[PDB]
Amino acid sequence: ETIVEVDLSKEDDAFLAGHTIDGRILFPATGYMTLAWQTFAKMQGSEFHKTPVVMENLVFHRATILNKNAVVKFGINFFDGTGAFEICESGSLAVSGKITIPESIDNEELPLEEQTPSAVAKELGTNDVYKELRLRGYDYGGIFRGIVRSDTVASTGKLQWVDNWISFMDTMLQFSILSKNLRELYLPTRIERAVINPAKHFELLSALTKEEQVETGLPVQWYSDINVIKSAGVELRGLKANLAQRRPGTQAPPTLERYQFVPNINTTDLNENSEKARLHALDVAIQVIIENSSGAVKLKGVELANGRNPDVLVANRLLQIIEGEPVLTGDVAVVTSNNNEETITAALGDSGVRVVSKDVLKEPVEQNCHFVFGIDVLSRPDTKTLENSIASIRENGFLILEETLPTYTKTGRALLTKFGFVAVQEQSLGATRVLVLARKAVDLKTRKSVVVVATEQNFNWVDDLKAALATAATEEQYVYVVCQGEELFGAVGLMTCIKNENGGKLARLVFVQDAKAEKFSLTSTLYRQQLEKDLISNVLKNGAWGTFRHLKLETQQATLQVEHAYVNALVKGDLASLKWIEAAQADDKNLETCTVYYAPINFRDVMLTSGKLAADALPGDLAEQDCVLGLEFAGRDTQGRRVMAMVPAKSLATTCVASKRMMWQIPEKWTMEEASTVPCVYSTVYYALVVRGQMKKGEKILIHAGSGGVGQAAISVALAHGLTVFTTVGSKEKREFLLKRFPKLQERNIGNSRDTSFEQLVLRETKGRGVDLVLNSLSEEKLQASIRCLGLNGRFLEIGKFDLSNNSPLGMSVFLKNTSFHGILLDSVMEGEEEMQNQVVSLVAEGIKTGAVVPLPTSVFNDQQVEQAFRFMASGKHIGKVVIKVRDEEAGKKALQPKPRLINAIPRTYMHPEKSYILVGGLGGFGLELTNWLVTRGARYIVLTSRSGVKTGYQGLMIRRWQERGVKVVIDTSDVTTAAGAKKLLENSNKLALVGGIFNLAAVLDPKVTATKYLDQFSRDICTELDYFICFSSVSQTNYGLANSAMERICEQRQVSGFPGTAIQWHPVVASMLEVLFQGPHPAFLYKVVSHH
């Protein structure tokens, strides 16, 4: 064999790094083809660029992953006899196919003329194309970014030429993937024929400049009817791509933190749960410290742990809060006086909290800390603990002291006062306990200071502040920014705006909501004690000073009692991800909404969840849908009738819409539990054995997997029709079960399904004659063995999927016996014509009365044991049908209207399908992905405001896709910044369909403020069905910060006046964030988005 070594460290192979797929370098399929092409021409004596070839039956058996160093060896071999070749890489097959040098390369090509470009939507540019691909998982780079141009449907386009066949042929595959509707990762599986004509290729390239070859490129064509990709000298027929596995991304979902006003003196726990309340108290404390550490990049702290359990210390949590803050790292240590270092060090673990050994009595634990945490420090009899804690912090440092309330009151405050400290904050920890944040006070009298008005009536107050900040440094003074009773100034935003200014450390914000209050003054009794704390943020709300702090939300996976829900596998790899999800409400024909009581799991559900089966295989448009699990169910009709049904999907829910054609009314003496087992397995058995196979009495049939769902149903019907039955079983217990359960099943006729032994058994018992039918769900060597069991005029009935999917080879000698091979897909029935559906149900219907249709044994699981239910079926020890008990059946087994129930499911908010949704700046990157998400959540009326209009092909693409999905898209190009424009937008949009939501986007890349201001104002009058008013943006330019402050206030004010209003402060990330935001209620006026990506 020929060995070919490629090393990405070398210049010639370096380009291969450009073919990155899902975060890893993959040796391109076209790479293999080139290797086969090159080496084959070499041994023939010619140069490969001088040698035309025809490749056939190309199979790409597995992907080849390369590292950075990437020294990988490819082994190639050719058969002189047939021309079959193979490429091996790591002692395992990589690629196979056939290659021959044709008589006439011109005669091997198809006479195809160029297609007329599609003008349905704007064409895609190079950047549009690869933006699209990026979202699917393709991370192409370098020369592999060779698609210069493509029309909106990718029927025609252009590919550049850089004297590189691998990259060029790859872009042909990229181009074919564009036309695919499903936006997921596809990798080549097969190519039926690949005609390469080098002579023709270069004489076409000669007609182009070296520049044109790169800037303009070569035409590429995609003919969907004949399945051909043609560009210049390369012609590709019969391309097959399979959906690939996506690596379990290391991107944690985003969390949301809500802002709220926290009084310095708060006598109410921050949470209902005492433990969570304490954690919040600590979170607030560290926040205040960070807020008042000027521009500190490192935050130093310690925790006194004398007479405490190593486990209960909070050090880890503190460092975790610190580290959480952007561009900030923490130096947290645990101080111990009891010299039990080894014990303590183990408790902290992999947190990275150091341990210092010092006796807090008589000496300082450490120098220049930002804070010191301690419990019962003011309780101690001696003040020495406190004293050395004070000596350990820097002058403006803090003390976080957890104390018992009774003690803290009678002596605690005096002790702090005695040592010159003031209680900056007091947060209750239930009753009998309190968290106290202490600090040395500052003297307002002795230090120079000046005040800035910070009002909206003066437009230039920002320059006044800037001028003051610069002067402040020189003049050794502090600046008080006073903002009393002003609109469009949110305290949080305004604070951030000040902090980031040059010399901002010298500023102090005095924010007063109520306009009726003592004027700002250092002397006033109201302000004096407060401003003596020297906090940069001071907010007065209803007589109480405080700050705006962001609290971590508890609902990462919270469960609310909903009325309607379905089961979903959130991450395919892990079955623990199976959870109930709240379903959208319903807004006909030959349909019926039923109440689900029993929903069985079938292998298709397992295969889908596990990922062994891709989504593209799912019938119709299910690959798009979220709710796909559930193939059948037993339940109640709209009129409370006892019914069992069969559906393509969505039966694994509290309710399901079933087709009347595919429904049976449950008979008496059948429990819903029993009935649920019948629809699928028996519809399958009858469509296979009676319709397709046309089985006759006295014939011999081989039913594989006897003690399985389909097997049991098959054996029952077959024996009922009078056939001689052969079967196989997976184990001793499975053997025993069948024997005892059925009428005249011969032990002689039960083989073993684990191996091929059943072949000898059947041939022996049939004296070489074989059987007339085979119902097969086995694969590979067991399938070919089953073929050998087929006798004259036999009829093979395949209900498995492996060999079909893998396109395994079938020896056609079997057909000499006047036989038939039947691919049997029940899905095709339900997806197919109607009469076939009506016949199969008739067969099942007729069968039940005959007694041929018997319900199967059941392994029942309740709504909470869905995980165990799936894992149990996957194992394969189960006999019969696995059923989930959604509802307990009412007693008497008669017709009856169902009692209402609630089920615990992850809450989920859907859009209203008869409302409009305005996205200001909706055609920007953020806007497009937001719109898409709304569409998947049920939005059917979209309004996008854009001054420039459609600019990119990608934009036109998304609009085309939304319109094809039946969405009404309006591009409003009017000036929304004015009052008249905003008013007009809202009135037109409302007339299209009542506005349900308004989304303001400052994230795309003041006018930002004024549009929101007017949109807010007029929507109150016009939009009476508005559910959402959301403003997106990033944290912290000085004018951008002020735009945030304004939007913050707008949303706060809206809520005050009883309107929806939410400010969101910080494209795979968008969808992830939106899911969290709408996962349950989120009524706070401002939220912080924490990224973990």
Under the binding rule (CB under 8 A), the answer on residue 473 touching its own copies is no
Pairing label, strands 1028-1033, 995-1001: parallel
In whole angstroms, the minimum distance from the beta carbon of 535 to Br ion comes to 59
Is 162 in contact with 208 (CB distance < 8 Å)? no
Under the binding rule (CB under 5 A), the answer on residue 791 touching Br ion is no
Determine whether 803 is an active site residue: no
Q: Considering only residues 823-862, where is the footprint of its own copies by CB under 8 A?
A: 823-825, 828, 832
Q: Considering only residues 674-733, where is the footprint of its own copies by CB under 8 A?
A: 692
Among 227, 345, 477, 859, binds its own copies (CB under 8 A): 227
Both tokens assigned to 977:
């910044």
Determine the interface stretch with Br ion among 26-34, 314-322, 821-829, 1009-1017 (rule: CB under 5 A): 26-34
Pairing label, strands 663-665, 642-646: antiparallel
Determine whether 721 is an active site residue: no
Under the binding rule (CB under 5 A), the answer on residue 254 touching Br ion is no
Under the binding rule (CB under 8 A), the answer on residue 153 touching its own copies is no
The option from Br ion, its own copies, none interacting with 86 (CB < 5 to 8 A, set by class) reads its own copies
Nearest in space to 20 (alpha carbons), one of 247, 251, 238, 248: 247
Name the phi and psi angles at 355, rounded to 5. Answer: -135, 125
The option from Br ion, its own copies, none interacting with 811 (CB < 5 to 8 A, set by class) reads its own copies
Residue with tokens 């909404």: 593
Is 491 in contact with 539 (CB distance < 8 Å)? yes
In whole angstroms, the minimum distance from the beta carbon of 798 to its own copies comes to 6
Under the binding rule (CB under 8 A), the answer on residue 235 touching its own copies is no
Under the binding rule (CB under 8 A), the answer on residue 759 touching its own copies is yes
Helix (H), strand (E), coil (C) string for 300-344: EEEEECCCCCCCCCCHHHHHHHHHHCCCCEEEEEEEECCCCHHHH
Under the binding rule (CB under 8 A), the answer on residue 110 touching its own copies is yes
Q: How many residues in the chain?
A: 1093
Under the binding rule (CB under 8 A), the answer on residue 768 touching its own copies is yes
The option from Br ion, its own copies, none interacting with 692 (CB < 5 to 8 A, set by class) reads its own copies
Angstrom distance (rounded) from CA 137 to CA 1086: 33
For residue 750, which amino acid is it? I
Under the binding rule (CB under 8 A), the answer on residue 92 touching its own copies is yes
Q: Considering only residues 38-67, where is the footprint of its own copies by CB under 8 A?
A: 59
Residue with tokens 């081989």: 702
In whole angstroms, the minimum distance from the beta carbon of 62 to its own copies comes to 11
Both tokens assigned to 476:
């050794």
The option from Br ion, its own copies, none interacting with 227 (CB < 5 to 8 A, set by class) reads its own copies
Under the binding rule (CB under 8 A), the answer on residue 317 touching its own copies is no
Determine the interface stretch with its own copies among 398-406, 554-562, 620-628, 758-766 (rule: CB under 8 A): 758-766
CA distances, 992 to each of 79, 516, 906, 989 (Å): 68, 45, 33, 5
In the Cβ-directed half-sphere of 30, how many Cα atoms lie within 13 Å? 20
Among 18, 20, 25, 28, binds Br ion (CB under 5 A): 28
- Nearest residue to Br ion by CB is 29
Under the binding rule (CB under 5 A), the answer on residue 472 touching Br ion is no
Under the binding rule (CB under 5 A), the answer on residue 628 touching Br ion is no
- The secondary structure element, H or E, covering residue 567 is strand 565-569
Among 818, 875, 1037, 1057, binds its own copies (CB under 8 A): 818
CA-based Rg of the chain, rounded to a whole angstrom? 36
Angstrom distance (rounded) from CA 972 to CA 981: 10
Q: What is the DSSP string of 826-894?
A: HHHHHHS-HHHHHHHHHHHHHHHHHT---PPPEEEEETT-HHHHHHHHHHT---SEEEEESSPPPTTS-
Angstrom distance (rounded) from CA 110 to CA 426: 83
The option from Br ion, its own copies, none interacting with 90 (CB < 5 to 8 A, set by class) reads none
In whole angstroms, the minimum distance from the beta carbon of 683 to its own copies comes to 14
Among 9, 807, 864, 1038, binds its own copies (CB under 8 A): 807
Both tokens assigned to 9:
């460290």
Among 206, 525, 813, 875, binds its own copies (CB under 8 A): 813
In whole angstroms, the minimum distance from the beta carbon of 435 to Br ion comes to 59
Q: Considering only residues 189-218, where is the footprint of its own copies by CB under 8 A?
A: 192
Residue with tokens 């036999």: 794
Among 2, 26, 96, 98, binds its own copies (CB under 8 A): 96
Under the binding rule (CB under 8 A), the answer on residue 612 touching its own copies is no
Residue with tokens 């990798």: 187
Q: Which is nearer to its own copies, 110 or 391 (CB)?
A: 110
Q: Which is nearer to its own copies, 410 or 767 (CB)?
A: 767
In whole angstroms, the minimum distance from the beta carbon of 787 to its own copies comes to 11
The option from its own copies, Br ion, none interacting with 301 (CB < 5 to 8 A, set by class) reads none
Three-state DSSP at 169 gives: helix
CA distances, 1012 to each of 677, 697, 1036, 1044 (Å): 57, 78, 18, 11
In whole angstroms, the minimum distance from the beta carbon of 33 to Br ion comes to 10
Q: Considering only residues 69-88, where is the footprint of its own copies by CB under 8 A?
A: 75, 77-82, 84, 86, 88
Q: Which residue(s) pair with 560 in the sheet?
A: 905
Pairing label, strands 544-552, 537-541: antiparallel
Under the binding rule (CB under 5 A), the answer on residue 29 touching Br ion is yes
In whole angstroms, the minimum distance from the beta carbon of 676 to Br ion comes to 44
Q: Residues 12, 128, 139, 170: which is the catalytic one?
A: 170
Three-state DSSP at 458 gives: coil
Angle formed by the axes of helices 315-324 and 274-291, nearest 10°: 50
Q: Which is nearer to its own copies, 496 or 684 (CB)?
A: 684
Q: Which is nearer to its own copies, 225 or 443 (CB)?
A: 225
Angstrom distance (rounded) from CA 144 to CA 67: 18
Q: Considering only residues 1023-1062, where is the footprint of its own copies by CB under 8 A?
A: none
Helix (H), strand (E), coil (C) string for 192-240: EEEEECHHHHHHHHCCCCCCHHHHCCEEEEEECCCCEEEECCEEEEEEE
Nearest in space to 267 (alpha carbons), one of 277, 257, 258, 259: 277
The option from Br ion, its own copies, none interacting with 102 (CB < 5 to 8 A, set by class) reads none
Binding residues for its own copies, rule CB under 8 A, total 62
Angstrom distance (rounded) from CA 582 to CA 657: 16
Among 98, 822, 961, 1067, binds its own copies (CB under 8 A): 822
Under the binding rule (CB under 8 A), the answer on residue 815 touching its own copies is yes
In the Cβ-directed half-sphere of 397, how many Cα atoms lie within 13 Å? 21
Q: What is the dihedral of CA 273, 274, 278, 279, to 10 degrees?
A: -30
Determine the interface stretch with Br ion among 28-36, 293-301, 620-628, 845-853 (rule: CB under 5 A): 28-36
Under the binding rule (CB under 8 A), the answer on residue 811 touching its own copies is yes
Q: What is the DSSP string of 418-453?
A: HTTEEEEEEEE-SSSEEEEEEEE---TTTS-EEEE-
For residue 107, which amino acid is it? N
Under the binding rule (CB under 8 A), the answer on residue 752 touching its own copies is no
The option from its own copies, Br ion, none interacting with 767 (CB < 5 to 8 A, set by class) reads its own copies
The option from its own copies, Br ion, none interacting with 572 (CB < 5 to 8 A, set by class) reads none
Q: Residues 7, 12, 13, 19: which is the catalytic one?
A: 19
Both tokens assigned to 230:
């043609």
Q: Which is nearer to its own copies, 85 or 598 (CB)?
A: 85
In whole angstroms, the minimum distance from the beta carbon of 110 to its own copies comes to 7
Both tokens assigned to 463:
């320059």
Which residues are designated catalytic?
19, 170
Residue numbers of the site for Br ion (CB under 5 A)? 28-29
Residue numbers of the site for its own copies (CB under 8 A)? 1, 59, 75, 77-82, 84, 86, 88, 91-94, 96, 110, 192, 224-227, 238, 692, 759-760, 763-764, 766-768, 788, 792-793, 798, 801, 803-825, 828, 832
